[PDB]
Design a protein around this ligand. Structure first.
Ligand SMILES: CS(=O)(=O)Nc1ccc(C(N)=O)cc1
Length: 291
């Protein structure tokens, strides 16, 4: 699967908020473009002259993530974060010359991402009480991945001492994205666990944090809540459910070619981190069928 690369797989079946540190520093920001940031301003001006209702918004930028030695006490992950914006994304990762910026970053900084906005996404493997994962169909009229299958998520907007507030906003934002798009009550959702980080190589390597969330409602109750909002309550055009039993072999199905890269990342990390049992009981042939 060339359109997705794993940057991080979390240990212990996934990390809770209390085990993650963030360092938010201007040292983690995008580098100014070789010919000046005027090229981003020019793309933005041109876009507003066709769509004058568009607005900019701040975003978190992922610089890097370091995992502690496995089995250790204390914080298990450090996230190095800077700040970016929707405007900087449209002028870099979304630009037709994004591959040229990646090559110049390798040359100048030894870092393919140095000249890229790289806004941080969040996504969820959302499981129902009757053991299904939740999937959403994208509109065929949108600019990125039209008509493809997605999972719930988004790109969080800002507002270990500033750090712990940033980790809280990341975990908070995946729950808020589930409530806004699936129309679920917040009290039906578990605290999220971080499964890992995946990169979208079709969007010049931008990364998404992928989380596991468990809902106390059944698939039928989740569908009712989603539909009861009506067409204006969601950006997606449909919802559907796959048994967790069948998610194991999803990359061998015709569904796999319809999944957007960030949803592929969520399902690969769910299979590696929540699936794949390590012990004798769940490992037994009747419970883990070979092939
Ligand atoms: C049309 S989209 O599928 O919502 N794609 C996006 C990609 C990046 C950003 C960002 N973090 O600036 C926001 C949205």
């Amino acid at each position: 699967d060339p359109e997705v690369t794993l940057l991080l797989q979390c240990p212990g079946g996934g990390l809770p908020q209390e085990q993650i540190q963030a360092e938010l520093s201007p040292a983690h920001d995008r580098r100014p473009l070789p010919g000046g940031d005027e090229a981003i301003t020019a793309i933005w001006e041109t876009r507003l002259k066709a769509q004058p209702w568009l607005f900019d918004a701040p975003k978190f930028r992922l610089h890097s993530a370091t995992l502690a030695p496995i089995g250790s006490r204390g914080p298990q992950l450090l996230l190095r974060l800077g700040l970016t914006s929707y405007r900087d994304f449209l002028g870099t990762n979304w630009s037709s010359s994004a591959a040229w910026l990646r090559q110049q970053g390798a040359t100048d900084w030894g870092d393919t991402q140095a000249y890229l906005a790289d806004p941080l996404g969040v996504g969820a493997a959302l499981a129902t009480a009757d053991d299904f994962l939740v999937f959403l169909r994208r509109s065929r009229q949108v600019a990125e991945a039209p008509g493809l299958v997605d999972v719930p998520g988004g790109h969080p907007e800002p507002q270990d001492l500033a750090g712990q507030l940033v980790v809280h906003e990341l975990f908070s934002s995946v729950l808020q994205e589930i409530c806004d798009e699936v129309n679920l009550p917040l009290l039906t959702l578990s605290q999220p666990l971080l499964l890992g980080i995946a990169r979208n190589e079709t969007s010049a390597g931008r990364a998404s944090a992928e989380f596991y969330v468990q809902c106390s409602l059944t698939s039928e109750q989740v569908r009712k809540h989603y539909l009861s909002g009506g067409p204006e309550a969601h950006e997606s055009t449909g919802i559907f459910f796959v048994e967790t039993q069948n998610v194991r072999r999803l990359p061998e199905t015709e569904m796999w070619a319809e999944l957007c890269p960030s949803a592929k990342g969520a399902i690969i990390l769910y299979n590696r981190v929540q699936g794949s049992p390590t012990g004798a009981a769940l490992g037994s042939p009747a419970l883990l069928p070979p092939l």
